[PDB]
Amino acid sequence: MTLCTEVTKEGTYKNDNFKEYVRHVEEYDLQFVFQLCKITLTAEIMTYIHTMD
Amino acid sequence: VYLPPVPVSKVVSTDEYVSRTSIYYYAGSSRLLAVGNPYFSIKSPNNNKKVLVPKVSGLQYRVFRVRLPDPNKFGFPDTSFYNPDTQRLVWACVGLEIGRGQPLGVGVSGHPYLNKFDDTETSNRYPAQPGSDNRECLSMDYKQTQLCLIGCKPPTGEHWGKGVACNNNAAATDCPPLELFNSIIEDGDMVDTGFGCMDFGTLQANKSDVPIDICNSTCKYPDYLKMASEPYGDSLFFFLRREQMFVRHFFNRAGKLGEAVPDDLYIKGSGNTAVIQSSAFFPTPSGSIVTSESQLFNKPYWLQRAQGHNNGICWGNQLFVTVVDTTRSTNMTLCTEVTKEGTYKNDNFKEYVRHVEEYDLQFVFQLCKITLTAEIMTYIHTMDSNILEDWQFGLTPPPSASLQDTYRFVTSQAITCQKTAPPKEKEDPLNKYTFWEVNLKEKFSADLDQFPLGRKFLLQSGL
Amino acid sequence: VSRTSIYYYAGSSRLLAVGNPYFSIKSPNNNKKVLVPKVSGLQYRVFRVRLPDPNKFGFPDTSFYNPDTQRLVWACVGLEIGRGQPLGVGVSGHPYLNKFDDTETSNRYPAQPGSDNRECLSMDYKQTQLCLIGCKPPTGEHWGKGVACNNNAAATD
Amino acid sequence: EVNLKEKFSADLDQFPLGRKFLLQSGL
Amino acid sequence: MASEPYGDSLFFFLRREQMFVRHFFNRAGKLGEAVPDDLYIKGSGNTAVIQSS
């Protein structure tokens, strides 16, 4: 975008009366849908998970 | 230990209480036309409220506002399919056509006093040429776009706009704050055109950065995210879009840059490089070829599952169809002479600029009934009041009483003033706005096949 | 890991981000805080969502699983990345870019005198879309200055 | 960082993705 | 022709058109509706005559 304002006002165009600015904007969204998981927790898996993290 | 938090009220689809009948009715408008100046409206010199030639281009949201006849004031030859007391009737929509017929061609706009400083592609040397104004006359094209939105409630668009700042901050630069505004898309306002969906009246002091068609106007853009997120979904049934854009030339503004580039990022020069040129850039979009296979009109569109829970039903017996086209946006130009002889002088002629756009609409509707029992009117009451009164079958006390005394006075107002609040229903909320009103109260039919849409629709269904 | 049939929606509201495309602007007298952040379309946008723990949650029935010996964990099955915006491109440039000559159509020449020839030019960038999701943050790669090997009489600097 | 910590739901067809999911599974 | 009930002008029809713009020229002569005042800011000197748009 190009934002451009003035400070003073006259009836004749003089470019030093104005200032100009540049801006930019974003608009986002996220949408998820999840499922639910159950783990049977025996002795081998607890070691397997332990070395993952 | 926690709990499932709250039980709350929820909507249910319109497949469950509205039952549909196999009685189909065509409707169709005649060729709606429009013609005027594509740049600015010219008003009468004395009367400063009436127009003379309205301003119409490709870029306006050409939002329509159809009307339907009531499907309860019909005298049917056999009323055996519904009891007239317990039931009611309402229209469903099942098809659509938006015909256009002008030949193709993209139109071009411009400005005579545009802020073109210099060419920023091939050779932008040093020093900068001084002077008070270097503003010139340029013309540019627009990003081609086609879309189509219908629904039971009129569509909502948005745009950036200058707002309110905060309390006093010490080393803050002068910067106007930016905020979102939701509104209703009036007829005639422009669409975005590669200059961002922002306001242009109260954000450009110099008024010399965009062409005339967007110079003192506020081009909006619809929210596809919000209107689907409405729980009732009565703002979108069905929507299409196709647009493209690419950059044609590179230009830049001129002036004291409102934020100076910091000195840490570039090595300072001298000689012919005492003063540093600005970085206020803007490009000019143009758009591309317009085929005859990248169109979105002159085609049927059947509906079988709308994207909301409103499966086509239009309460209140109106729709809101809105289309934008920028592909058929030509600008034929006129020539009127002054004094005629076979030696040319350029002041012997005085020209106009005009622009013409037409449309067409065609529909096919489907009669569907509502059984009105006890557990249903409690559901429609939470959606809207205006539906249930407009079948004119009863009145509703708005509370079942309230607990508090509410401090009722009787002594006719001479002690301590209160807000007397005289009401006014005002009979609709949309009457402030302006649309293309079309009527369809006298254009129904019961025999489809004498029309284009009926002959295409019946070949789909096999009936 | 087993699978169940209890799907759960989760949607975020919209997001706001606005600033200057070219550089972040810091206040005077601080040089640690910012007036406006540097917001442009060319920047990466990583998102770190956070989820509720599925063991401290308000499930309406606690009798489909055995709490002594099991564990509940979320899984992704669907996604969409919303967007609401025009279709505008953006241009950037450099006030003192080292555009020396022109060499696409004509370069008729003697030797040219002069010291600086930095000009103010501008060009856009390649359009590129990519989305990628993950349980661990993604890793990129980039080149840089390495070991100069400290020997063997470097004739090229 | 976007925090979805208290944004969940147990019904699907009240949000613009869940209806789009429901026809896909056939449920 | 499609909306004529007897339908005796079209048995079959096809079309393909395409078009884009190459150059830009401005016409000459005096504008019928010259531009109203509150959409621009005047100048002085070499910006004397408004260019015909």
CSV table of N, CA and C in Angstrom, one decimal, chain A residues 1 21-42 53, chain C residues 2-4 7-10 12 14 17-20 69-73 75 77 80 82-84:
chain,number,residue,atom,x,y,z
A,1,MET,N,0.8,-1.2,0.0
A,1,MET,CA,0.0,0.0,0.0
A,1,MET,C,0.9,1.2,0.0
A,21,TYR,N,4.2,7.1,2.9
A,21,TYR,CA,4.6,6.0,3.7
A,21,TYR,C,4.2,4.7,2.9
A,22,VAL,N,5.0,3.6,3.2
A,22,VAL,CA,4.6,2.3,2.6
A,22,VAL,C,4.3,1.4,3.8
A,23,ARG,N,3.2,0.7,3.6
A,23,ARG,CA,2.8,-0.4,4.5
A,23,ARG,C,2.5,-1.6,3.8
A,24,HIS,N,2.3,-2.7,4.5
A,24,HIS,CA,1.9,-4.0,3.9
A,24,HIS,C,1.2,-4.8,5.0
A,25,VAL,N,0.4,-5.7,4.6
A,25,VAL,CA,-0.5,-6.4,5.6
A,25,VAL,C,-0.7,-7.8,5.2
A,26,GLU,N,-1.0,-8.7,6.2
A,26,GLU,CA,-1.3,-10.1,5.9
A,26,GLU,C,-2.5,-10.5,6.7
A,27,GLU,N,-3.3,-11.4,6.2
A,27,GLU,CA,-4.4,-12.0,6.9
A,27,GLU,C,-4.3,-13.5,6.7
A,28,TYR,N,-4.4,-14.3,7.8
A,28,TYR,CA,-4.2,-15.8,7.7
A,28,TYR,C,-5.3,-16.5,8.4
A,29,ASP,N,-5.3,-17.8,8.3
A,29,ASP,CA,-6.2,-18.7,9.0
A,29,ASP,C,-5.6,-20.1,9.0
A,30,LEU,N,-5.9,-20.8,10.1
A,30,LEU,CA,-5.6,-22.2,10.2
A,30,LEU,C,-6.8,-22.9,10.6
A,31,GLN,N,-7.0,-24.1,10.0
A,31,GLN,CA,-8.1,-24.9,10.5
A,31,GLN,C,-7.7,-26.4,10.5
A,32,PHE,N,-8.0,-27.1,11.6
A,32,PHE,CA,-7.5,-28.4,11.7
A,32,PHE,C,-8.7,-29.3,12.1
A,33,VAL,N,-8.5,-30.6,11.9
A,33,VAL,CA,-9.4,-31.6,12.4
A,33,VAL,C,-8.6,-32.8,12.9
A,34,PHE,N,-8.8,-33.2,14.1
A,34,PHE,CA,-7.9,-34.2,14.7
A,34,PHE,C,-8.6,-35.5,15.1
A,35,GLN,N,-7.8,-36.6,15.3
A,35,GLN,CA,-8.3,-37.9,15.7
A,35,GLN,C,-7.6,-38.2,17.0
A,36,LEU,N,-8.2,-39.2,17.7
A,36,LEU,CA,-7.7,-39.6,19.0
A,36,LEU,C,-7.1,-41.0,19.0
A,37,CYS,N,-6.0,-41.2,19.7
A,37,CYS,CA,-5.2,-42.4,19.5
A,37,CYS,C,-4.9,-43.0,20.9
A,38,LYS,N,-5.1,-44.3,21.1
A,38,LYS,CA,-4.8,-45.0,22.3
A,38,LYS,C,-3.6,-45.9,22.1
A,39,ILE,N,-2.7,-46.0,23.1
A,39,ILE,CA,-1.5,-46.8,23.0
A,39,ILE,C,-1.6,-47.8,24.1
A,40,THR,N,-1.5,-49.1,23.8
A,40,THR,CA,-1.3,-50.1,24.8
A,40,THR,C,0.2,-50.0,25.2
A,41,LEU,N,0.4,-50.0,26.5
A,41,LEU,CA,1.7,-49.6,27.0
A,41,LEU,C,2.3,-50.8,27.7
A,42,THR,N,3.1,-51.6,26.9
A,42,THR,CA,3.8,-52.8,27.5
A,42,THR,C,5.3,-52.4,27.6
A,53,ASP,N,12.7,-40.0,22.4
A,53,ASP,CA,12.8,-38.8,23.1
A,53,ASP,C,12.6,-39.1,24.6
C,2,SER,N,-3.1,-47.5,18.3
C,2,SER,CA,-4.4,-47.9,17.8
C,2,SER,C,-5.1,-46.6,17.2
C,3,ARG,N,-6.3,-46.8,16.7
C,3,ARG,CA,-7.1,-45.7,16.1
C,3,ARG,C,-8.5,-45.8,16.7
C,4,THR,N,-9.1,-44.6,17.0
C,4,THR,CA,-10.4,-44.6,17.5
C,4,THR,C,-11.3,-43.8,16.5
C,7,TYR,N,-13.7,-37.9,16.3
C,7,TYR,CA,-13.0,-36.7,15.7
C,7,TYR,C,-13.3,-35.4,16.5
C,8,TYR,N,-12.4,-34.5,16.4
C,8,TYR,CA,-12.5,-33.3,17.2
C,8,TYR,C,-12.0,-32.1,16.3
C,9,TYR,N,-12.9,-31.1,16.2
C,9,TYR,CA,-12.5,-29.9,15.4
C,9,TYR,C,-11.7,-29.0,16.2
C,10,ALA,N,-10.8,-28.3,15.5
C,10,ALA,CA,-10.1,-27.2,16.2
C,10,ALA,C,-9.8,-26.1,15.1
C,12,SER,N,-8.7,-21.9,14.5
C,12,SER,CA,-8.3,-20.7,15.1
C,12,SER,C,-9.0,-19.5,14.4
C,14,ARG,N,-8.9,-15.5,13.0
C,14,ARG,CA,-8.0,-14.9,12.0
C,14,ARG,C,-6.8,-14.2,12.6
C,17,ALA,N,-1.2,-8.9,11.0
C,17,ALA,CA,0.2,-8.6,10.9
C,17,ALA,C,0.3,-7.5,9.9
C,18,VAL,N,1.1,-6.5,10.3
C,18,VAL,CA,1.1,-5.3,9.5
C,18,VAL,C,2.4,-4.5,9.8
C,19,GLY,N,3.0,-4.0,8.7
C,19,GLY,CA,4.2,-3.2,9.0
C,19,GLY,C,4.8,-2.7,7.7
C,20,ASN,N,6.1,-2.3,7.7
C,20,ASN,CA,6.9,-1.8,6.6
C,20,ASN,C,7.6,-3.0,5.9
C,69,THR,N,-3.0,-48.3,32.0
C,69,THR,CA,-2.1,-48.9,31.2
C,69,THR,C,-2.1,-48.3,29.7
C,70,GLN,N,-2.8,-47.2,29.5
C,70,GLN,CA,-2.9,-46.6,28.2
C,70,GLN,C,-2.6,-45.1,28.2
C,71,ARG,N,-2.5,-44.6,27.0
C,71,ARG,CA,-2.1,-43.2,26.8
C,71,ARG,C,-2.8,-42.7,25.6
C,72,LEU,N,-3.3,-41.4,25.7
C,72,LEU,CA,-4.1,-40.8,24.7
C,72,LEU,C,-3.2,-39.7,24.0
C,73,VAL,N,-3.3,-39.6,22.7
C,73,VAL,CA,-2.4,-38.7,22.0
C,73,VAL,C,-3.2,-38.3,20.7
C,75,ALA,N,-3.7,-36.8,16.8
C,75,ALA,CA,-3.2,-37.2,15.5
C,75,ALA,C,-3.8,-36.3,14.4
C,77,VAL,N,-5.4,-35.4,10.8
C,77,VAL,CA,-6.1,-36.1,9.7
C,77,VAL,C,-6.6,-35.1,8.7
C,80,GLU,N,-6.5,-27.2,6.5
C,80,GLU,CA,-6.5,-26.2,5.5
C,80,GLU,C,-5.9,-24.9,5.9
C,82,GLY,N,-6.2,-21.1,5.4
C,82,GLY,CA,-7.1,-20.1,4.8
C,82,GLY,C,-6.3,-18.9,4.4
C,83,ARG,N,-6.9,-18.0,3.6
C,83,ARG,CA,-6.3,-16.8,3.1
C,83,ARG,C,-7.4,-15.8,2.6
C,84,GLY,N,-7.3,-14.5,3.0
C,84,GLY,CA,-8.2,-13.5,2.5
C,84,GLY,C,-7.5,-12.2,2.1
